[PDB]
Structure formats: C-alpha cells, structure tokens
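Q: Could you predict the 3D structure of Amyloid-beta precursor protein G38L mutant?
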Amino acid sequence: SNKGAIIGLMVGLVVIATVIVITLVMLKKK
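A: Sure. Here are the predicted structure tokens for Amyloid-beta precursor protein G38L mutant:
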C-alpha cells in the first residue's frame, strides 16, 4: 500500500492519458 498516497497524483494523470490515446485515432488516418 505504498502507492496509496500516490493515488491522488495518478487520478489526475490518468485523465491526461485519455487525451493521448485519442490523439492516435486521428493521426491514424494521416
């Protein structure tokens, strides 16, 4: 449970990951 206090930082980072995964959906057509 050493990453329990990190959850507050990962929760805000994941939201940023959802933006990168979609960016690939567009360039995929190029």
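Q: Anything worth pointing out?
A: The radius of gyration is 14 Å.
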